[PDB]
Amino acid sequence: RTYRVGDIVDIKVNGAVQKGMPHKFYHGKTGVVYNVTKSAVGVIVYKRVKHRYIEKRINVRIEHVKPSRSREDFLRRVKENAELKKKAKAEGVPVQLKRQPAMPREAHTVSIADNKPVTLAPVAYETTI
């Protein structure tokens, strides 16, 4: 797999080399590629200092770089938003196009006919013996 200038990549230093490696801040970070070399790549990372952002450039080898899926969900949601909007226009019915956060659970009833509860002590009596 080759990398090109402009895409978004993750930096994960693989292997057991993380013993005396100097700079562990950029492990697990995500950035934009600005320079490509055969076995190295240039990554633009941002760091927060108090109230501002400071840009940094790092040179990371290829085996510690994987492509990112940051925009995958956005491009997907755009695709099915267009598709279900066209389907809703074809069928003449409304449909939800916005994500909603998780709602509280509603009222329901749980039967104990075949699911009689088990009484638990703070420690197990099998462990006491």
């Binding site: 749980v110 699911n115 009689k116 509860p117 009484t119 638990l120 002590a121």
Partner: peptide, 8 residues
């Protein structure tokens, strides 16, 4: 159908 647990 998860199991139910009861304590006092």
């Amino acid at each position: 159908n998860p199991a139910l647990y009861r304590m006092r």
